[PDB]
Every structure is written in C-alpha cells, then in structure tokens.
Amino acid sequence: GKWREQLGQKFEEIRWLIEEVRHRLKITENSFEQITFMQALQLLLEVEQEIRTF
Numbered sequence: 001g002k003w004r005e006q007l008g009q010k011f012e013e014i015r016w017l018i019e020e021v022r023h024r025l026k027i028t029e030n031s032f033e034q035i036t037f038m039q040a041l042q043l044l045l046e047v048e049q050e051i052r053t054f
Contacts, residue, residue: 004051011048015041 022037 004054007051008048011044011051015044015048018044 018037018040022041025033027033
C-alpha cells in the first residue's frame with residue numbers, strides 16, 4: 001500500500017544522499033568517521049527492512 005511505499009522511497013533517498021557524501025571523502029578504514037558511516041548505513045538498511053516487514 002501507498003504509505004509504506006512512499007516511506008521506503010524516502011529511505012532509499014536518505015541512504016543515497018549518505019552514500020554520496022561518503023563517496024566524496026577520503027578517509028581510512030578504521031577512522032571514527034568510516035566506522036560512523038557504516039554504522040549509519042547499516043541502521044538505515046535495517047530500518048528500511050523493518051518497514052517492509054511490518
């Protein structure tokens with residue numbers, strides 16, 4: 001139904017803007033910064049799965 005589908009589109013767009021700002025950075029694999037981006041991306045995928053599964 002329409003509400004879920006519109007949320008899921010907003011989640012995809014949030015994730016996409018986050019990937020783009022991460023893509024412009026040149027940072028190391030154990031930077032607090034890298035660790036923080038991974039953790040946000042993961043939390044964001046998990047939340048989008050949960051909306052799908054409600």
